[PDB]
Design a protein around this ligand. Structure first.
Ligand SMILES: *[C]C(=O)[N][C]C1=[C][C]=C2[C]C3=C([C])[C]=C([C])N3[B](F)(F)N12
Ligand SMILES: [Ca+2]
Ligand SMILES: [Ca+2]
Lengths: 563, 80, 80, 91
């Protein structure tokens, strides 16, 4: 295999005999696959063998194998923390292999926890952080694999960002400075540019956290301060213009509804009925709803300019389009008169859909936003079972239309279905509909009507409504299972989508990347996977041990026991 | 040994008695009595024909297992 | 309750349960449990031509019954 | 609630097993010459033109051969002491 005795002595890690060969001269040759003695001594973690090798010439510390791995690549791949600490105390170069992986990438892929802690806690940590290469599917930015593979060592990295620079706890001059140097690109790689070929979407470490389910990293005090920095920079401001422009039409609609009697029409001069009392209030709320609606057109027309053909795959946008037209038809007597029946018909649609859509604007919160996610997932699985409702209401509604035909609730087929839909909750009347018609001999088919009554009561209020309850219990259960991550991922996706459309010069102004906080001045499957790796190297050691014992019997003096 | 087949047998006879005045006249009370049975059981059985789907067929399996454990406790309802 | 109560205040305005906005919300809060009347409030006004907007009132009735007694009350059950 | 819970626990497999049992019962009664006509056995699709108990059972087998190796290792070491030169340490 081309191994010199220097290779064999360093492979099994015999430091005294590897000192003897260097005392004579060994030239540090490379075998087949191009490994020197330092590649063998590192793959094995014989730091005492690596030490005497590294004190001779330093001409071997930067050699490359057939894949271009240096000695730090092997010591970090097999997880020898004292070997990489020795190989970094000496200024051995940090490079990439043929697969564009640094030694930090190999330790992260092989999940070597004690190695990457010695990479972080030692010097040269920034220069192996920036040593990665782009345009590579594996071996990305070293932070992103640290989220992806070793989140506990990212927590140690975040502890280095949270510095105090003080020792007087609960003092007036006491402060905790949070640094966000590891949570973000420098924002030039966030926007598409011909000079910036990198297309890293912003909030890189936090978007990696919500993808890799790292909830313990998201609740870190550096990441909480980072989101609160992003909130106060532009997140609270952009949320207040969006909610503020909506309330500019929401509130004057509600003032206009509760101050005018919903029958008759009204000019801007007042109610026609002609009242002309508090006509200043009616005029400005008429004006404010009209301007907020045409602001909502330009808000929606600006949304289709930024989102082409994926705008129309959203159901919330058609709610806004109902909202803004019916707002205008409610206040169209600013310019042209309309019938009072049409005005309040569009008024009832507008004031209903305003508050239904205002429910969606608090989805971008934390204390009450999880109930809108629960409301959406229950509503989605009710519209997924809507055909079972249609066929049950057609079964019971058309049969009740035949049986109870002489009663006014069941006179047309389209009033039989609505009444059957009203009896769905358990509001079967049974006295004015079943019993008192039966005692007056007004039931045409008495025995079928009571049989349809019993079969209705079993199916729809008992069985069907308990099905929707049991659907909703399971749907809330898996939402609450991921609820703590969902509210943080909604905050991250908010700020990610916000500064994706913000200009870069504005983002340079509001970002501050390091905040100073004065405190006193104003779980089981991971244990099994750790145990499987702790057993996989145990059986690897035992097989390596077994060939040694087989070698002992192979080379042993036997004279007294020769049968 | 299948309960869905007796639903079809109610469906097809009561369909014919609803439209038996094609050939022989019947009383109006009998015709609409079989009409109410037929139009009720058509849509109840059409619920079974969408069990052989994917987007809504899982609710029929949920509807069947809830209905099976309600008819397993029917004697507790009778005695209450 | 502001969405459904103010819309019911506009649609069913001639009925005494929905006469002021502050009595429309309490009635909508009372209909939350499934005590939608539908006969003295929706059906018999419709058969007497006393509904101003008939097609919207039944559409608001169906959308209320889906949202608040069915969907919203099952959300509170599954939370509990 | 309990009846929907164990249906939804197997729901992703249930819809696929209902599709499989559909086609299995369908072509069990279909004629063989018709099945020869409609089956094509290789389709070409143009895309752009138009979990824990298994870990334990893997670990048990990775431990069962480990103790098998160690027992095989133990008889070798017992053989070393059985056939060994001892002159300096003969008490
Ligand atoms: C890793 C992550 O994720 N972030 C961070 C980054 C990205 C990209 C980049 C670039 C650069 C340069 C050129 C320099 C530096 C420092 N950098 B960084 F920030 F690392 N990055
Ligand atoms: Ca929108
Ligand atoms: Ca059949």
């Amino acid at each position: 295999h081309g191994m010199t005795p220097l290779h064999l002595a360093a492979k099994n890690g015999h430091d005294k005999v590897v000192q003897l060969l260097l005392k004579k001269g060994a030239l540090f040759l490379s075998d087949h696959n191009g490994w020197t003695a330092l590649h063998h001594a590192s793959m094995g973690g014989y730091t005492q063998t690596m030490k005497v090798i590294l004190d001779t010439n330093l001409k071997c510390t930067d050699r490359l194998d057939e894949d271009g791995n240096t000695a730090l690549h092997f010591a970090a791949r097999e997880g020898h923390a004292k070997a990489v600490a020795l190989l970094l105390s000496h200024n051995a170069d940090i490079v990439l292999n043929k697969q564009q992986a640094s030694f930090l990438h190999l330790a992260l892929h092989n999940k070597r926890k004690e190695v990457v802690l010695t990479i972080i806690r030692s010097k040269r940590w920034d220069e192996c952080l920036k040593i990665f290469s782009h345009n590579s599917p594996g071996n990305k930015c070293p932070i992103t694999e640290m989220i992806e593979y070793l989140p506990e060592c990212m927590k140690v990295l975040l502890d280095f960002c949270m510095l105090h620079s003080t020792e007087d706890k609960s003092c007036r001059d006491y402060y905790i400075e949070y640094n966000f140097k590891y949570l973000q690109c420098p924002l030039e790689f966030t926007k598409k540019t011909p000079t910036q070929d990198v297309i890293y979407e912003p909030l890189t470490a936090l978007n990696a956290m919500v993808q890799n389910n790292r909830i313990e990293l998201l609740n870190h005090p550096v990441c909480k301060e980072y989101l609160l920095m992003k909130w106060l920079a532009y997140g609270f401001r952009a949320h207040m213009m969006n909610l503020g422009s909506y309330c500019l039409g929401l509130i004057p609609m509600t003032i206009l509804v509760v101050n005018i009697k919903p029958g008759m029409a009204f000019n801007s001069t007042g109610i026609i009925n002609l009242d002309t009392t508090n006509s200043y209030l009616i005029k400005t709320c008429m004006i404010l709803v009209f301007l907020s609606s045409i602001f909502g057109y330009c808000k929606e027309a600006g949304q289709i300019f930024q989102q082409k053909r994926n705008y129309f795959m959203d159901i919330s946008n058609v709610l806004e389009w109902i909202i803004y037209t019916t707002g205008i038809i409610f206040v169209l007597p600013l310019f042209v008169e309309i019938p009072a029946h049409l005005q309040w018909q569009c008024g009832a649609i507008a004031v209903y859909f305003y508050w239904m859509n205002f429910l969606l604007y608090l989805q971008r919160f934390e204390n009450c936003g999880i109930f809108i996610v629960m409301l959406e997932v229950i509503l989605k699985t009710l519209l997924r079972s809507t055909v079972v409702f249609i066929f049950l209401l057609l079964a019971f509604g058309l049969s009740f239309y035949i049986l109870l035909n002489l009663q006014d609730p069941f006179s047309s087929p389209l009033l039989s279905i609505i009444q059957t839909f009203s009896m769905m909750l358990g509001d079967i009347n049974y006295r004015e509909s079943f019993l008192e018609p039966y005692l007056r001999n007004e039931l045409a088919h008495p025995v079928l009507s009571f049989a349809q009554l019993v079969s209705f009561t079993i199916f729809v209020p008992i069985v069907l409504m308990n099905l929707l309850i049991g659907l909703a219990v399971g749907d809330i259960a898996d939402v609450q299972k991921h609820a703590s991550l969902k509210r943080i991922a909604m905050q991250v996706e908010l700020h990610t989508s916000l500064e994706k459309k913000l200009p870069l010069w504005f983002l340079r102004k509001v970002d501050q990347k390091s905040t100073i906080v004065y405190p006193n001045k104003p779980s089981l499957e991971m244990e099994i996977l750790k145990q499987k790796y702790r057993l996989k190297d145990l059986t690897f050691l035992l097989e390596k041990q077994h060939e040694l014992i087989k070698l002992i019997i192979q080379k042993m003096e036997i004279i007294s026991e020769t049968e």
